[PDB]
């Protein structure tokens, strides 16, 4: 619980370290409540929201990745690096870059505690990162209509790997204001039970459909190439959670 | 705050067996083109619109699942950034809709041909509808994995695939620098349309597990002491004689009567083979050096002699023997020779193709030993076994 | 006026005139992608005529620009379509409306 001089914080610690061969593989962790960017693209009316993470001692910055993650993230590779990030750039008239994730590598960024922070303005559309009160030149421009989630993926090299710190800045509204519609005007950070951490399970159970689409393929001819043809109207009911984009 | 349910249309994807990837040891031209022909399609079979998108996809990232997935539903090639597509009006990537200006501004309709191009060397994906160029061009995508043609056909649509000229006639001429995809057909099996990561198949109910795939890494195809150098020279002479006998030209001569360029080539080949054998860490074969000519040549008879009259004098088949434990070593040496030959060809610009385009710097056999054809692998194994038997006949025996 | 992005071309020979009943098949949805109303699932084509003011003014303008046998995406600013609050329980206040209207036939 947040104190007078301590913002509402969530701490992640390794239950077992150095005992019974505890796993030290990098873990992918995502927050529950995302931030919804404003559809329109033009001090209490600020559109910027800031959250910080206090990296405790014993954790190497080189194995620290904090930022924002697109809800379309399905990567569970141990060898995690900034260079190994899926991204594409669309060029029309216009030129925009869309990526599955937006971190800055901790090793290139920096027993001191590295207080990594991320500043995102929904109206501006640009994301900035500040560590220990020092700004950074790394900037990313997400699409105007997006549902980015808070992102932090670390490799556990210490009993306490990383801990959250949801606190309002000097003039930037807390992330809880953007996460919750009701608390939009409330400047006091809160840590409600819905704001729980989530890890990326490598495999999850999924129901196999009873009836599949009937697809038949054959060689049309020497000059017509391969041909496929399916004539079967199949429809399905979809349950989608607004919090996290899924079907 | 709550959940919403609506009727969505089931989607599935198909893909030919051909694989195209980019790597340091690339065996492809780096730029491939395919054409897509669309037959009669019902614009609205159900309440939801028909989902038709064509583009490239990653071999390990794009794993479409029937039913649930990213976005509201109907996951296709544009639903995830692992794949890219073009539906006619909007260029989709990662379930993000971005309209692209077109000369026709028409959706996917029958009696139309869709042409797309991709460059492996430089990230650039360009597609054209009915020959009309599209301003929107995909760019700045990493080359890991393999890009393959894929269509996310809807329930009521019928589409035709034109991978290359051999498979079918192209509606439009390929752009310069782009080759038809029929030249990228894997030699192991013919190019046929197959579902991507399908866990179910029809059973005359045939459950299917994970499908094995080859990454871009798989797509990439010592000291000689004077005492061993003498044996290497003897093996060079023997190999030259064997090649002359097999080819039965001035090269069709004896081991010591071979032409000077032929003798130099045989010496270089024997030196390379000896270096490869030494790098394998086999046993010391410097034994019975004087017994190199122990075997009796069969070239003395007129029938074995070539038409030119020269006697190559090769090693005796009965005298020459191959150790059963050396079969693995022979196969490894043949694989190393094939790999170094493919690397040398790639250094000159030669790449894998369905045909032998020597002026265009294309090597039809530029494939790794694992992916090599049965005939080529058998020939390499036979050559390695013959070399091992020749070495054994000269008194050189190693354990590997 | 409302923006019209022609997904599918139309003949354009005939146009909906004033006082003539018009048949549409719309699949409107919000900006976020969550659909709210559509006439295709109900299997009942929607019938309306220009000048009755029954439909929103943006919809009438789009139908006026619309052509027989043509599919296009029609988006509405919240000012013209349900200004401030409008249709509680379906359309949130100050929300845009994107429609996919298509002419099966005229009167």
Catalytic residue among C4, C11, C15, C36: C36
**In chain C, helix, strand, coil percent, each to 5?**
10, 35, 60
Nearest to A70 by CA among A43, A103, A44: A103
* Distance separating alpha carbons of residues A90 and A11, to the nearest angstrom: 39
Report H helices in B280-397.
Answer: 327-347, 374-393
Bridge partner list, A11: A163
Q: How was this structure determined?
A: cryo-EM
Tokens read off for C33:
């992608």
* Distance separating alpha carbons of residues A178 and A184, to the nearest angstrom: 6
β-strands B54-57, A11-13 pairing: unpaired
Collect all residues of chain A within an 8 Å Cβ-Cβ radius of residue C32: 39, 145
Nearest to A60 by CA among A106, A3, A117: A106
Range list of β-strands (E), chain B: 4-9, 14-16, 20-21, 31-38, 54-57, 90-92, 97-99, 112-119, 124-129, 132-133, 137-139, 146-151, 158-162, 179-180, 193-195, 200-201, 206-207
Tokens read off for B204:
């005359």
Cβ neighbourhood burial of B180 (10 Å; 0-12, 13-18, 19+) = buried
β-strands B193-195, B54-57 pairing: unpaired
Report the 10 Å Cβ neighbour count for A13: 13
Residue B322 near residue B381, CB atoms below 8 Å: no
Q: Say yes or no: A82 contacts chain B, CB-CB below 8 A.
A: no
Report the 10 Å Cβ neighbour count for B27: 23
Resolution to 1 decimal place, in Å: 3.7
Report the 10 Å Cβ neighbour count for C77: 13
| Direct distance between the N- and C-terminal alpha carbons of chain B, in angstroms, rounded to an integer | 69
- For A234, name the nearest residue in chain B, comparing CA atoms only: B10
Which candidate from A84, A231, A246 shows the least CB-CB separation from B68? A246
> 3-class secondary structure for chain A?
CCCCCCCCCCEEECCCCCCCCCCCCCEEEEECCCCCCCCCCCCCCCCEEEEEEEECCCCCHHHEEEEEECCCCCCCCCCCCCCCCCEEEEECCCEEEEECEEEEEHHHHCCCCEEEEEEEECCCCEEEEEECCEECCCCEECCCCCCCEEEEEECCCCCEEEEEECCCCCCCEEHHHHHCCCCCCCCCCCCCCCCCEEECCCCCCCCCCCCCCCCEEEEEECCEEEEEECCCCCEEEEEECCCCCCC
* Beta-carbon contacts of residue B358 (< 8 Å; ≥ 6 apart): none
* Distance separating alpha carbons of residues B1 and A234, to the nearest angstrom: 29
Q: Say yes or no: C7 contacts chain B, CB-CB below 8 A.
A: yes
Which candidate from B6, B43, B44 shows the least CB-CB separation from C35? B6
Collect all residues of chain C within an 8 Å Cβ-Cβ radius of residue B96: none
Q: Which helix (H) or strand (E) holds C61?
A: helix C57-65
HSE-up (13 A, CA, CB side) for residue A72: 27
Cβ neighbourhood burial of A10 (10 Å; 0-12, 13-18, 19+) = middle
Helix (H, G, I), strand (E, B) or coil at B274: helix
- Sign for the CA dihedral angle at B248, B251, B253, B256 comes to negative
Would you call A145 and C96 a contact, using CB atoms and an 8 Å cutoff?
no
> Cα–chain-centroid distance for residue B37?
26
Report the 10 Å Cβ neighbour count for B26: 21
Residue B125 near residue B137, CB atoms below 8 Å: yes
Q: How many residues does chain B have?
A: 400
Give one word for C19, left, alpha or beta, with left for phi > 0 and alpha for psi -120 to 50: left
Residue B395 near residue B291, CB atoms below 8 Å: yes
DSSP state of B210: P
The C-alpha angle with vertex C60 and arms to C58 and C65, in degrees rounded to 5, equals: 95
Residue A234 near residue B9, CB atoms below 8 Å: yes
Angle, in degrees to the nearest 10, between helices B374-393 and B226-247: 130
Which candidate from C7, C35, C41 shows the least CB-CB separation from B107? C7
B156 Cα to chain A: minimum distance (Å): 5
HSE-up (13 A, CA, CB side) for residue B328: 7
Nearest to B54 by CA among B10, B88, B30, B80: B88
Report the 10 Å Cβ neighbour count for B252: 24
Interface of B with A in 30-89 (CB under 8 A): 35, 37, 39, 45-48, 61, 65-73, 75, 80-82, 84
DSSP state of B7: E
Cβ neighbourhood burial of A171 (10 Å; 0-12, 13-18, 19+) = exposed
Collect all residues of chain C within an 8 Å Cβ-Cβ radius of residue A145: 31-32
* Distance separating alpha carbons of residues B52 and C8, to the nearest angstrom: 14
Q: Which helix (H) or strand (E) holds C21?
A: strand C21-24
Q: Say yes or no: B161 contacts chain A, CB-CB below 8 A.
A: yes
Query: Is there a catalytic annotation at residue C4?
Result: no
Would you call B72 and C33 a contact, using CB atoms and an 8 Å cutoff?
yes
Q: Say yes or no: C104 contacts chain B, CB-CB below 8 A.
A: no
Nearest to B147 by CA among B127, B131, B123, B173: B123
* Beta-carbon contacts of residue A79 (< 8 Å; ≥ 6 apart): none
Measured CA distances, C85 to A184, B24, C61, C77 (Å)? 20, 60, 22, 13
Residue B191 near residue B16, CB atoms below 8 Å: yes
Nearest to B4 by CA among A239, A206, A195: A239
Tokens read off for B216:
């871009």
B127-144 in b/e form (b: 16+ CB < 10 A) is: bbbbeeebebbbbebebb
In order of start, what are the domains of chain C with their CATH numbers? 1-107 (3.10.50.40)
Give chain A's radius of gyration (CA, Å).
22
* Distance separating alpha carbons of residues B248 and C69, to the nearest angstrom: 74
Which candidate from A89, A209, A217 shows the least CB-CB separation from B66? A209
Report the 10 Å Cβ neighbour count for B72: 22
> Cα–chain-centroid distance for residue A128?
15
* Distance separating alpha carbons of residues B376 and A117, to the nearest angstrom: 59
Nearest to A118 by CA among A101, A142, A145, A136: A136
| Direct distance between the N- and C-terminal alpha carbons of chain A, in angstroms, rounded to an integer | 34
The C-alpha angle with vertex A153 and arms to A147 and A159, in degrees rounded to 5, equals: 140
Tokens read off for B165:
């000229």
* Distance separating alpha carbons of residues B390 and B373, to the nearest angstrom: 26
Residue C82 near residue C95, CB atoms below 8 Å: yes
β-strands C97-106, C21-24 pairing: antiparallel
Helix (H, G, I), strand (E, B) or coil at C59: helix
* Chain A contact residues (CB < 8 Å to C): 39, 145
């Amino acid at each position: 619980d947040g104190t007078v001089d301590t913002p509402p914080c969530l701490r992640l610690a390794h239950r077992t370290w150095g005992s019974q061969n505890s796993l030290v593989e990098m873990l992918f962790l995502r927050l529950s409540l995302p931030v919804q960017f404003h559809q329109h693209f033009r001090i209490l009316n600020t559109t910027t929201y800031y959250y910080s993470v206090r990296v405790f001692a014993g954790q190497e910055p080189s194995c620290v990745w904090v930022g924002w993650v697109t809800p379309d993230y399905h990567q569970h590779d141990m060898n995690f690096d900034l260079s190994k990030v899926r991204a594409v750039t669309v060029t029309m008239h216009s030129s925009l870059k869309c990526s599955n994730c937006y971190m800055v590598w901790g090793g290139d960024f920096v027993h001191t505690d590295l207080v990594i922070g991320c500043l995102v303005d929904l109206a501006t559309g640009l994301m900035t990162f500040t560590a220990n009160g020092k700004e950074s030149n790394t900037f990313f421009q997400v699409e105007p209509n997006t549902k980015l989630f808070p992102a932090v993926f670390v490799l556990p090299t210490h009993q306490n790997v990383i801990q959250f710190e949801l606190g309002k800045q000097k003039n930037i509204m807390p992330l809880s204001a953007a996460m919750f519609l009701s608390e939009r005007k409330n400047p006091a950070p809160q840590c409600p039970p819905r704001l729980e951490v989530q890890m990326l399970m490598p495999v999850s159970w999924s129901r196999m459909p009873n009836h599949f689409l009937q697809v038949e393929t054959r060689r049309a001819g020497e000059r017509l190439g391969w041909a496929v043809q399916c004539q079967d109207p199949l429809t399905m009911m979809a349950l989608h959670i607004p919090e996290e984009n899924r079907c | 705050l709550l959940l919403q349910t609506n009727l969505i249309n089931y989607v599935t994807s198909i893909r030919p067996n051909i694989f195209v990837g980019r790597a340091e040891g690339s065996t492809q031209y780096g730029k491939w083109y395919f054409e897509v022909m669309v037959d009669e399609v019902v614009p609205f079979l159900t309440a939801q619109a028909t989902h038709l998108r064509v583009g490239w996809a990653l071999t390990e990232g794009y794993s479409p699942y029937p039913g649930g997935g990213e976005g509201w539903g109907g996951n296709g090639v544009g639903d995830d950034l692992y794949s890219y597509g073009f539906d006619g009006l909007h260029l989709w990537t990662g379930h993000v809709a971005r309209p692209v200006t077109s000369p026709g501004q028409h959706l996917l309709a029958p009696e139309d041909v869709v042409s797309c191009c991709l460059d492996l060397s430089v990230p650039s994906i360009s597609f054209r509808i009915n020959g009309c160029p599209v301003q929107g061009v995909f760019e700045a995508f990493n080359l890991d994995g393999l890009f393959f043609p894929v269509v996310s056909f809807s329930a009521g649509v019928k589409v035709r695939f034109l991978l290359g000229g051999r498979h079918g006639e192209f509606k439009f001429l390929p752009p310069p620098g782009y080759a038809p995809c029929h030249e990228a057909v894997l030699p192991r099996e013919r190019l046929r349309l197959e579902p991507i990561k399908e866990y179910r198949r029809e059973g005359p109910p045939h459950l299917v597990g994970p499908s094995r795939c080859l990454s871009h890494t798989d797509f990439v195809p010592i000291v000689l002491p004077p005492h061993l150098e003498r044996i290497r020279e003897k093996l060079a002479e023997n190999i030259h004689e064997l090649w002359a006998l097999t080819r039965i030209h001035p090269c069709l001569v004896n081991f010591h009567s071979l032409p000077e360029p032929e003798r130099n080539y045989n010496l270089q080949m024997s030196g390379e083979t000896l270096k490869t054998l030494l790098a394998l860490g086999c046993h010391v074969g410097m034994a019975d050096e004087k017994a190199e000519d122990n075997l009796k040549k069969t070239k003395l008879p007129k029938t074995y002699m070539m038409s030119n009259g020269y006697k190559p004098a090769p090693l005796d088949l009965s005298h020459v023997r191959l150790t059963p434990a050396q079969t693995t070593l022979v196969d490894r040496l043949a694989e190393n020779g094939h790999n170094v030959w493919a690397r040398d060809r790639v250094a000159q610009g030669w790449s894998y193709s369905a045909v032998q385009d020597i002026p265009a710097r294309r090597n039809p056999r530029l494939v790794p030993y694992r992916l090599l054809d049965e005939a080529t692998k058998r020939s390499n194994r036979d050559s390695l076994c013959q070399a091992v038997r020749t070495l054994l006949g000269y008194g050189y025996n190693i354990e590997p | 006026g409302v923006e019209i992005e022609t997904i599918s071309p139309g003949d354009g020979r005939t146009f909906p005139k004033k006082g003539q009943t018009c048949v549409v098949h719309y699949t409107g949805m919000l900006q976020n992608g969550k659909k709210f109303d559509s006439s295709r699932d109900r299997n009942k084509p929607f019938k309306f005529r220009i000048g009755k003011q029954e439909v929103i003014k943006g919809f009438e303008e789009g139908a006026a620009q619309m052509s027989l046998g043509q599919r296009a995406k029609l988006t509405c600013t919240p000012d013209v379509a349900y200004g401030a609050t409008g249709h509680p329980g379906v359309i949130p206040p100050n929300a845009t409306l994107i429609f996919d209207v298509e002419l099966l036939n005229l009167e």
